C-alpha cells in the first residue's frame, strides 16, 4: 500500500477583528496527526495522535516556528492578492493550500503536490513534472513569474523529494501500529416506509479504517448505481470511518435487492439484504 503526507493550511483575513487566522492541519493517510491554529491560547504546533508524542522537545519547536513563519508569509500574501485583484481592503478573503507527497510501498516517491486557491477558487499549482507552474487567472500569472525567477519550483522539488518523503517514512514508522492497520467494516440495512407503496432501504457500513470503501445496491446482478443515494464517507470521531447508501424499491419486493461492501479489510466483499 502507498501512503502520503498532506498539509491543509488556511489563512483568513478578518478586517476590523485583528490579524488573520492561520491554521495548519496535517495527515498521514486519513488520520490527523498534527496541527496549528493561531487562535489557540498558546499557538504551538501540537500532536493529534499518540505516536506523535514520541518526538523530542526540539521537533515541536522547529515546527511551531516555521509555522509562525508561514503565518506571517500568508499574512503578507493576503494583502498582496488584494492588489492583484483590485479588491477592497474591507472584505474578508481566504487562501487555502495543500502540499504533500505520496509514495509507494517501497518507500519511494510516487507523487508530489502543492496547490494554492483563493476565496474558494483555483489560484496556482505545481505541475506533476515538479518544474513548471499552472496559473489559473492572470493574477496568479504574476506569482508564477516571481517563483520562476526565484527558482521556487526547484526549491520545492528539493522539499518534496527530500524532507517530505523522508519524514513520511519516519511517521509511518513511529506509528505504523496505527497507520498501517486495517479495521474491517461491520454492516447492516435499515428499512423505511414511504408514500405510494414505496420503500427506502439503507445500507450502513461502520467502524472501518482506511476511509476507502465502496457500497452498491444490486438487483438480479446489476448495480442500480443511478437510482441510488449515499453520503461522502465520514470520520466517526475515534479514528475510523463510515458510509451509507440507500435505494428506493417497491414494497414487498425488497429481498430481491442486496448491498455490496468493498473494503481493504474484506477479503470477500460483504453482501447483505434486509432482515424483516
Amino acid at each position: 500500500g502507498p501512503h502520503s503526507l498532506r498539509y491543509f493550511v488556511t489563512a483568513v483575513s478578518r478586517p476590523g477583528l485583528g490579524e488573520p487566522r492561520y491554521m495548519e492541519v496535517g495527515y498521514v493517510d486519513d488520520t490527523e496527526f498534527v496541527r496549528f491554529d493561531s487562535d489557540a491560547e498558546n499557538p504551538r504546533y501540537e500532536p493529534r495522535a499518540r505516536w506523535m508524542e514520541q518526538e523530542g522537545p526540539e521537533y515541536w519547536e522547529r515546527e511551531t516556528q516555521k509555522a509562525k513563519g508561514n503565518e506571517q508569509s500568508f499574512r503578507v500574501d493576503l494583502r498582496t492578492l488584494l492588489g492583484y485583484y483590485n479588491q477592497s481592503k474591507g472584505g474578508s478573503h481566504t487562501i487555502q493550500v495543500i502540499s504533500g507527497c505520496e509514495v509507494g510501498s517501497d518507500g519511494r516517491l510516487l507523487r508530489g503536490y502543492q496547490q494554492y486557491a483563493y476565496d474558494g477558487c483555483d489560484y496556482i499549482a505545481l505541475n506533476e513534472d515538479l518544474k513548471t507552474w499552472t496559473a489559473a487567472d492572470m493574477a496568479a500569472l504574476i506569482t508564477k513569474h516571481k517563483w520562476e525567477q526565484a527558482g521556487e519550483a526547484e526549491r520545492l522539488r528539493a522539499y518534496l523529494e527530500g524532507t517530505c518523503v523522508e519524514w513520511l517514512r519516519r511517521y509511518l514508522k513511529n506509528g505504523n501500529a496505527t497507520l498501517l492497520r486495517t479495521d474491517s467494516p461491520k454492516a447492516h440495512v435499515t428499512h423505511h416506509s414511504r408514500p405510494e407503496d414505496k420503500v427506502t432501504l439503507r445500507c450502513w457500513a461502520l467502524g472501518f479504517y482506511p476511509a476507502d470503501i465502496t457500497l452498491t445496491w444490486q438487483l438480479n446482478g446489476e448495480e442500480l448505481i443511478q437510482d441510488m443515494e449515499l453520503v461522502e464517507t465520514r470520520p466517526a470521531g475515534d479514528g475510523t470511518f463510515q458510509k451509507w447508501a440507500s435505494v428506493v424499491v417497491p414494497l414487498g419486493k425488497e429481498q430481491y435487492y442486496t448491498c455490496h461492501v468493498y473494503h481493504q479489510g474484506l477479503p470477500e466483499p460483504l453482501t447483505l439484504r434486509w432482515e424483516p
Binding site: 503526507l5 498539509y7 493550511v9 495548519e24 496535517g26 498534527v34 504546533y45 521537533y59 515546527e63 516555521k66 509555522a67 513563519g69 508561514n70 508569509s73 500568508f74 503578507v76 500574501d77 498582496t80 492578492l81 493550500v97 502540499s99 502543492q114 494554492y116 496556482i124 506569482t143 516571481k146 517563483w147 526565484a150 521556487e152 526549491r155 520545492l156 522539499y159 524532507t163 517530505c164 519524514w167 511517521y171
Partner: peptide, 8 residues
Amino acid sequence: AVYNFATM
C-alpha cells in the same frame, strides 16, 4: 515535515 511556504 511542514514546508516553508513562499510569498505570492
